[PDB]
Amino acid sequence: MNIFEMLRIDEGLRLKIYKDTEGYYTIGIGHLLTKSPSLNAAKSELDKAIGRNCNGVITKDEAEKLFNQDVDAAVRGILRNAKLKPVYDSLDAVRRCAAINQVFQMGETGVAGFTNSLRMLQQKRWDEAAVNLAKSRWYNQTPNRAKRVITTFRTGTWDAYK
Ligand SMILES: Nc1ccccc1F
Ligand SMILES: [Cl-]
Ligand SMILES: [Cl-]
């Protein structure tokens, strides 16, 4: 198991514009195109990202390319964040994959108000952090996924992903 497999499992793969759990236009492996309600804006954004007139559809290789760039960006986002970096670098390898997953999903922004859980993770109070993390809109909106990431942080193992 590695970050790619893990997120591939959490985001799935779709080659045609779709709406995500929040109703926004996305494609591929959880690649958010726009928050706007205009399909045309989403298609324009898609073409800009791929470099060609896609007409709302991409190939698997294209999807995989967007994915690579998005994982990259997520980690880089973390390392560049003064509040995130120290936490991230205190964790082991599996738990670092759970931090990337959360960032991939919610953004560095979303994750920065998890201040209290961040502190518990840094202190390595696993069970405490797990309870704290569940107390969030994130867990109430996407419980099945949130449960998998939470277990991941609680246990430091890939059990939740089998
Ligand atoms: N949850 C989390 C997210 C990003 C960096 C570190 C973390 F602990
Ligand atoms: Cl791109
Ligand atoms: Cl879910």
Residue with tokens 């928050």: 35
Whose CA is closest to 155, among 132, 111, 121?
121
> What is the rounded distance in angstroms from the CA atom of residue 17 to the CA atom of residue 150?
29
Cβ(130) – ligand 1 distance below 6 Å: no
Cβ–Cβ under 8 Å, residues 37 and 158: no
Tell me if 120 CB under 6 Å of ligand 1: no
Considering the domain delimited by 1-162, tell me its CATH architecture: Orthogonal Bundle (1.10)
20 noted as active-site residue: yes
Torsion of CA 94, 108, 21, 9, to 10 degrees: -20
Q: Are 104 and 71 in contact (CB under 8 A)?
A: yes
The whole-angstrom separation of Cα 156 and Cα 48 is: 38
114 is in an annotated binding site: no
94 and 128 Cβ atoms separated by less than 8 Å: no
Q: Record the resolution, in angstroms.
A: 1.9
| Cβ-contact 118, 98 below 8 angstroms | no
Task: Identify residues after which the chain is interrupted (C–N over 2.5 A).
Answer: none
Q: Is 144 annotated as a binding residue?
A: no
* Distance between CA atoms of residues 122 and 105, nearest Å: 21
Domain ranges of the chain: 1-162
95 Cα to the center of ligand 1, angstroms: 9
| Closest to 58 in 3D by CA, of 12, 14, 24, 23 | 14
Closest-lying ligand 1 atom to the alpha carbon of residue 91? 8
Closest-lying ligand to the alpha carbon of 140? 3
Q: Is 61 a catalytic residue?
A: no
Sign of torsion over alpha carbons 26, 145, 159, 96: positive
Gap between the Cα atoms of 8 and 29, Å rounded: 7
